[PDB]
Write a protein of this length. Structure first.
Lengths: 306, 305
């Protein structure tokens, strides 16, 4: 037992990280088959980032202007193209460590692991959520651009995130692996509104189920509620509205614990209206929303990969 | 910027995880060079665990009773020996994926990454601390025994922990890679007292420095304190006493931020006495003690491996 914010094993992704240098700028790239994917702002200087014309900037670059290094191995760039906000560098060698993989665009509220990298070398791995406002609250220092987020299902790596920017507010923004930003953000150093964030209600409920499974039950109460009644409370506390789709995805946890979803909603309602009175749930003094229902089932059932 | 509870990249360890089966029991082993390391209670049935005589139990086992599987590869066991609470199974093949590695015994308060595994297959990685009472608060289901904890320094993996037991209180106990338990625990299914835990003060201070570096400063206050005045408060709140060694290890963070260590202590004292008034620090509503000073420096400077 016990419940931890757990990341996927990162080995399959480590074998794909490379360093990409263009002029004065170095960041991380992702080497899959004979293509290296990286943020297009690798071609920008500090001043370019204030107002970059990427098409004009990229036209001044040739294949030999991109230095790609995999560990100490030098890759030969034989083609380059821009797809949305990512650069695709064709190299003459297929990555022998390419895992089975997919590119996926995840939905707000889904979770993934990030392999933070600098100069093409991994430094750490952590789990986070795509916020409802399409930011992530990561750990990204200068040079971390091109680090990727992913999920693993048995032997298949689903890449869902590539890191591009830190907003002036300190939160993080990036793209899917086709180079489309999550949210309204652009790869330009300018003020960018993220918009109101909200708490991922179905994830909070999943984590309450995880708490019950592990013996934390003080928050279970006498009440029930309706979906509409609960959503009135959700809106007041800036929680995502709960739908029947959410109720259905919580089904297996309700069945294991014997606690109907609307009964758990009534407990959550009381927690929102009355706070936690200085108590904790699974070692947290706040309501946690970075565990999906699938994450909870995974950890409580010992699902494995390779 | 931003500050996350970050684990080490686990690839170097994933390539060492194998499945070890002895009779009816399967758990995880660590395959390094031509030796596989695993908890000795792999030789125990459910009933054996109540009061095992490991010497007698192991005598009934031969090399061919240990099935070691690496992915789909079968390893040939050519020798076995018990070292404290671990079994060392000599195999006829050196693991081609063996990283540079060391075995280290860590101190209470130090942190490490756990690669949680089942049936020899990795399932997830997380960072945790060795508690002052030598337990860890992990996530370990049935079959996770033999999962290991480790740190990485550039290219070298320092293995420090092997998982052996879940105590009836739900916390976790294990050994170094020489098979010596951390804490007073034994590999027997019995009631075992862990003893009073305390909060790792030097780690809380490190995390407050991490907060300041990342822009959380509301807790910075008007006061200072003395080491003794602070330790009177520490003892009242079941915090480890702060020593000069702790002050010294916090030096680099004090220098980066310009906040003297004893001033940060005075901030911590006020947090202990007055709570956080419903505010948060680095997204947490409680004082976090699972980041060491080196952990903070690592994350805030982008150290890589």
């Amino acid at each position: 037992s016990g419940f931890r914010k757990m990341a996927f094993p990162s080995g399959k992704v480590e074998g794909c990280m490379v360093q990409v240098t263009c002029g004065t700028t170095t960041l991380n790239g992702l080497w899959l088959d004979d293509v290296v994917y990286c943020p297009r702002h690798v071609i920008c200087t500090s001043e370019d980032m204030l107002n970059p014309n990427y098409e004009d900037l990229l036209i001044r670059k040739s294949n030999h202007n991109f230095l790609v290094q995999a560990g100490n191995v030098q890759l030969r760039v034989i083609g380059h193209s821009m797809q949305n906000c990512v650069l695709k560098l064709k190299v003459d060698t297929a990555n022998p460590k390419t895992p089975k993989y997919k590119f996926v665009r995840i939905q707000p509220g889904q979770t993934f692991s990030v392999l933070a990298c600098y100069n093409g070398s991994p430094s750490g791995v952590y789990q986070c959520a795509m916020r409802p406002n399409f930011t992530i609250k990561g750990s990204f220092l200068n040079g971390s651009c091109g680090s990727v987020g992913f999920n693993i299902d048995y032997d298949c790596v689903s890449f869902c995130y590539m890191h591009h920017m830190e907003l002036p507010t300190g939160v993080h923004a990036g793209t899917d692996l086709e180079g489309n930003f999550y949210g309204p953000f652009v790869d330009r150093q300018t003020a960018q509104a993220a918009g109101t964030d909200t708490t991922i209600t179905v994830n909070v409920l999943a984590w309450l189920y995880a708490a019950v499974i592990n013996g934390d039950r003080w928050f279970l109460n006498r009440f029930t509620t309706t979906l509409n009644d609960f959503n009135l409370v959700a809106m007041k506390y800036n929680y995502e509205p709960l739908t029947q789709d959410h109720v259905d995805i919580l089904g297996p946890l309700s069945a294991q614990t014997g606690i109907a979803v609307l009964d758990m909603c009534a407990s959550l309602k009381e927690l929102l209206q009355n706070g936690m009175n200085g108590r904790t749930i699974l070692g947290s003094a706040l309501l946690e929303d970075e565990f999906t229902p699938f994450d909870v089932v995974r950890q409580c059932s010992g699902v494995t990969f390779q």
